[PDB]
């Protein structure tokens, strides 16, 4: 008859205590398997995983998005845009086996929320209820952003995710986490030095480092600084565009502000495409391990 | 925390894998993301000449020794709230002892 | 000259790749973010017609010769602080040679 709607349905009897148990499981494994990627740990790749699985959404026909958890299928799993994400998938496998009742999309998104919180970032309210959909619902590759582009490209790309200037700049601050790996994306290097702590370092480095546009070993160009950091062409476009620059500057000078906006934008990202019943529960705000005397 | 002598070799590996990213240990070595650590034991926190410390680190005004260093490395932000050093900490005593045994030697 | 002179096929792609988004060189060519660059060389900075220049580009009034032009491209904001041209600069002499040479020829 007409267009797709995805209704949030949380499994019977499953509530906040259940999901907090899953959060804890991820947070614990994040601490136990700490050697990954030269001790950066799996936090950054989990955040990138939550973003890539949600970022396939197209607001115009409601295809893609985190709802269906389709990254588990071949086509999306092998999207070149997802090179390296297999690591986050493997990290979460045992977790899913311990908690078989949680949906795939619910697990991928919760993984990003847990990683952000456990890396001392802002609390990200989260809502359960994503439901696995058949392989046929797997979007084709090509929906994630190219990093070799400019501000106009970034702005129009994010319009497809219903994101505005503020939301775009805030979400990009996640690049404070982890690093680019030449074998994965054709780009190499960290955006900063505090790779596994969620801060506003991305904006600070963008504004305070001396950047030089250079070719890397994969023959792509990236902006490099003397400190050994890098910025993708799309990251640097945030100080090339005037509108974006003003927001970069305000986050560079106010982390609490960045945190609040990032929290709102990341949850929105994670919930795009999802219709939540009006009688559905208020979003959950999980306690960190630290907050549990753990 | 109470330091107990350990393995300098294993401590060297811990340092290389967990600290070198941001710190050098040789005398006259350069500051990097973090302060060069030569002469760290016996000096007060935030006194490395030429490095821009956080306000919190300097105010801790801790005269570094093997014991409070062990306490610090167990949970940096906990011991010095607001420090900008990004590091969750070495939770195992054995790990902290091997590392400090090495640091005592490498810096000395 | 003090500035050498290079390949103009290279300069061409460098210009198409790094300057084209904002500037034309053809005669009559339309201003974009940047002024039409036709007959740049031999003119004073800030003269293109019916293009609005930051007072900074006007008040510097320098004749554009392949030499002051190369100092400029290395770092547009150091050269004409306040300029609004959003370019990081060409850190490579060949590039600068290669480009200028191209320009020399394209903006005749
Ligand atoms: C990602 C960065 C990074 C890593 C990894 C890191 N540090 Fe630090 N460290 C810093 C920074 C930055 C400071 C400055 C703290 C401040 O000013 O708040 C610092 C400060 C310290 C201090 C206090 C120095 C003084 O003079 O007061 C000690 C001691 C220290 N680090 C030891 C180590 C050891 C040992 C390790 C590893 C087990 C380590 N650091 C890992 C960045 C790092
Ligand atoms: C993103 C925008 C942008 C880019 C990239 C760019 N330009 Fe500019 N250019 C401008 C603007 C805007 C101005 C005027 C600046 C002002 O008024 O301060 C300008 C001014 C100039 C001027 C001075 C014009 C005059 O009449 O004095 C020259 C010469 C020039 N650009 C050449 C170049 C070259 C060569 C490149 C690339 C290698 C380049 N531009 C890249 C936008 C750009
Ligand atoms: C213009 C949009 C974006 C582009 C082009 C982009 C591009 C990239 C690329 C090229 C990498 C390196 C991958 C690798 O080589 O391992 C990466 C990593 C990462 N991105 Fe982005 N990104 C974008 C938006 C985002 C957003 C919105 C988030 C999350 C909110 C995000 C989170 C991450 C994380 C945390 C990593 C580090 C992964 C790791 O260390 O394994 N990115 N991104």
Angle (deg, nearest 10), helices A104-118 and A43-54: 140
Neighbours of B45 (CB within 10 A): 23
Spatial distance between the Cα atoms of A64 and A225, rounded to a whole number of angstroms: 36
Which of A82, A91, A156, A180 gets mutated to test ligand 3 (max ligand atoms within 8 A of its CB)? A180
For residue A132, give the nearest of A223, A287, A231, A11 by alpha carbon. A11
- CA distance readout (Å), A40 to A83, A174, A190, B11, B88: 18, 15, 11, 19, 11
Q: Is A230 helix (H, G, I), strand (E, B) or coil?
A: strand
Check: CB of residue A167 under 8 Å from CB of residue A268. yes
Q: How far is CA A175 from CA B73, C78, C94, in A?
A: 26, 29, 34
Name the residue of B34, B71, B97 whose CB sits within 8 Å of the most ligand 1 atoms, as the mutation to test its pocket: B34
User: With an 8 Å Cβ cutoff, are B86 and A197 in contact?
Assistant: yes
Residue A222, helix vs strand vs coil: strand
Domain A4-144+266-294 has CATH 3.20.20.150: no
Phi and psi for A231 in degrees, rounded to 5? Answer: -140, 135
Instruction: Count contacts between A and C (CB, < 8 Å).
Output: 7
CB spacing of B84 vs A31 below 8 angstroms: no
Cβ-defined contact of C91 to A212 (cutoff 8 Å): yes
Run of H or E including A275? strand A274-275
HSE (CB half, 13 Å, CA atoms) of A65? 29
Is B88 within 8 Å of A31 when comparing Cβ atoms? yes
Coil, strand, or helix at residue C4?
A: coil
Alpha-carbon span A154 to B1, nearest angstrom: 50
Test the A interface: residue of B33, B86, B92, B99 with most A CBs within 10 Å: B86
SS3 A224: strand
Nearest-CA distance A213 → chain C (Å): 8
Structure tokens at A60: 């115009």
* Cα A57 → chain centroid: 13
Q: A32: burial class by Cβ within 10 Å (0-12, 13-18, 19+)? A: exposed
Coil vs helix vs strand at A123: coil
Q: Is C33 on the interface with A (CB under 8 A)?
A: no
User: A234: Cβ below 6 Å to ligand 3?
Assistant: yes
How many Å apart are CA A220 and CA A218, to the nearest integer? 6
Q: Which residues line ligand 2 (CB under 6 A)?
A: C 18-19, 21-23, 33-35, 37, 40, 45-48, 53-54, 56-57, 73, 83-87
Domain with CATH 1.10.520.10 in chain A: 4-144+266-294
- Residue carrying the six token digits 């504004």: A207
Bridging pattern class, strands A274-275 and A6-7: parallel
> How close is the Cα of A262 to the center of ligand 3, in Å?
15
How far is Cα A178 from Cα A198, in angstroms, rounded to an integer?
10
The span from the CA of A51 to the CA of A115, in Å, is: 12
Residues of B in contact with A227 (CB under 8 A): 33
Q: Is C69 annotated as a binding residue?
A: no
CB A64 within 8 A of CB A139: yes
CA distance A96 to A107: 7
Sign of CA dihedral A246, A193, A30, A143: positive
Q: How far apart are CA A177 and CA A119, in angstroms?
A: 9
Token pair belonging to C77:
């904001």
Residue C23 has a CB neighbour count (10 Å cut-off) of 22
- For chain A, say whether B38 makes contact (Cβ under 8 Å): no
Query: Which chains reach chain B with 3 or more Cβ–Cβ distances below 8 angstroms?
Result: A
- Helix ranges (H only) for chain A are 16-32, 36-39, 43-54, 74-77, 86-98, 104-118, 151-159, 165-172, 182-185, 201-208, 233-240, 242-252, 255-271
CB burial of residue C94 (10 Å; 0-12, 13-18, 19+):
middle
Q: Which residues contact B1 (CB under 8 A, 6 or more apart)?
A: B67, B68, B70, B71, B74, B93, B96
According to CATH, the topology of domain A145-265 is Peroxidase; domain 2 (1.10.420)
Q: ∠ CA C99-C105-C108 to the nearest 5 degrees?
A: 130
**Radius of gyration in angstroms for the set of CA atoms belonging to chain C, rounded to a whole number:** 13
Q: Give Cα separations from B12 to A5, B32, B66 (angstroms).
A: 57, 19, 16
Tell which residue, B102, B103, B79, B101, has the closest CA to residue B89: B79
Closest among A7, A212, B98 to C88, alpha carbons compared: A212
CA distance linking residue B83 with residue B85, whole number of Å: 6
Alpha carbons A132 and A68: distance in angstroms, whole number: 4
In angstroms, the Cα distances linking B92 to A228, B40, B79, B89 are 31, 22, 16, 9
Q: Are A244 and A237 in contact (CB under 8 A)?
A: yes
Return the SS3 of C12. Answer: helix
Reduce the DSSP state of residue A125 to 3 states and report it.
Answer: coil
Structure-solving method: NMR
Which residues have C-beta within 8 Å of that of residue A140, sequence separation ≥ 6?
A: A75
Sign of CA dihedral B53, B57, B62, B65: negative
**What residues contact C84, with CB distance under 8 A and at least 6 apart?**
C54
Q: List, in order, residues 6 or more apart from A178 with CB less than 8 Å away.
A: A37, A40, A43, A44, A45, A47, A48, A190, A195, A196
- For chain A, count helices (H), then strands (E): 13, 5
In this structure, what token pair is assigned to residue C27? 């005669």
Q: How many domains does chain B have?
A: 1
Whether residue B21 and residue A193 make contact (CB cut-off 8 A), yes or no, is yes
List where CATH 1.10.420.10 sits in chain A.
Answer: 145-265
Calculate how close chain A gets to C86, using CA atoms only, in Å.
Answer: 7
| C-beta of residue C37 within 8 angstroms of C-beta of residue C107 | yes
Specify the CATH number for the domain of residue B90: 1.10.760.10
Q: Let me know if C17 is exposed, middle or buried by CB neighbors in 10 A (0-12, 13-18, 19+).
A: exposed
Cβ atoms C41, C69 nearer than 8 A: yes
Distance between CA A289 and CA A24 in Å, rounded? Answer: 7
CB A232 within 8 A of CB A180: yes
Neighbours of C26 (CB within 10 A): 11
Taking the C-alpha atoms of residue B9 and residue A182, their distance in angstroms, rounded to an integer, is 32
Rounded Cα–Cα distance for residues B17 and B26 (Å): 17
* CA distance linking residue A269 with residue A262, whole number of Å: 10
A contact chains, 3+ CB pairs < 8 A: B, C
d(CA C60, CA A83): 50
Tell me which residues of A are annotated as active site.
52, 191
Domain that holds residue B97: 1-108
Distance from the Cα of B86 to chain A's closest Cα (Å) equals 5
Structure tokens at C104: 């020399």
Residue closest to A157 by CA, chosen among A243, A59, A29: A59
Closest CA to B80 of B44, B49, B104: B44
């Amino acid at each position: 008859t007409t267009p797709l709607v995805h209704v949030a349905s949380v499994e019977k009897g499953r509530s906040y205590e259940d999901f907090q148990k899953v959060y804890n499981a991820i947070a614990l494994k994040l601490r136990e398997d700490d050697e990954y990627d030269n001790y950066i740990g799996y936090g950054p790749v989990l955040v990138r995983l939550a973003w890539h699985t949600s970022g396939t959404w197209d607001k115009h026909d409601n295809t893609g998005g985190s709802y269906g958890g389709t990254y588990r299928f071949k086509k999306e799993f092998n999207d070149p845009s997802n090179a390296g994400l297999q690591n986050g998938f493997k990290f979460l496998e045992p977790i899913h086996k311990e908690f078989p009742w949680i949906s795939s999309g619910d697990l991928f998104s919760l993984g990003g929320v847990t990683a952000v919180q456990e890396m001392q970032g802002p609390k990200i309210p989260w809502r359960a209820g994503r439901v696995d959909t058949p392989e046929d619902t797997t979007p084709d590759n090509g929906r994630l952003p190219d990093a070799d582009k400019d501000a106009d490209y970034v702005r129009t790309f994010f319009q497809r995710l219903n994101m505005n200037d503020r939301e775009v700049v805030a979400l990009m601050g996640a690049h404070a986490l982890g690093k680019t790996h030449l074998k994965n994306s054709g780009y190499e290097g960290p955006w900063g030095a505090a790779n596994n702590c969620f801060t506003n370092e991305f904006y600070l480095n963008l504004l305070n480092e001396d950047w030089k546009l250079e070719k890397n070993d994969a023959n792509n160009e990236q902006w490099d600084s003397k400190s050994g950091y890098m910025m993708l062409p799309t990251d640097y476009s945030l100080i090339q565009d005037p509108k974006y620059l003003s927001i970069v500057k305000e986050y560079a000078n106010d982390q609490d502000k960045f945190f609040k906006d990032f929290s709102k934008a990341f949850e929105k990202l994670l919930e795009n495409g999802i219709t939540f019943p009006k009688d559905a529960p208020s979003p959950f705000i999980f306690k960190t391990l630290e907050e549990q005397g753990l | 925390a109470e330091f107990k002598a350990g393995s300098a070799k294993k401590g060297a590996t811990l340092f290389k894998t967990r600290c070198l990213q941001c710190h050098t240990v040789e005398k006259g070595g350069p500051h990097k993301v973090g302060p060069n650590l030569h002469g760290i034991f016996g000096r007060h926190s935030g006194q490395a000449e030429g490095y821009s410390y956080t306000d919190a680190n300097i105010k801790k005004n801790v005269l570094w020794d093997e014991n409070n260093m062990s306490e610090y490395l167990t949970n940096p932000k906990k011991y010095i709230p607001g420090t900008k050093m990004c590091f969750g900490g070495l939770k195992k005593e054995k790990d902290r002892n091997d590392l400090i045994t090495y640091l005592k030697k490498a810096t000395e």
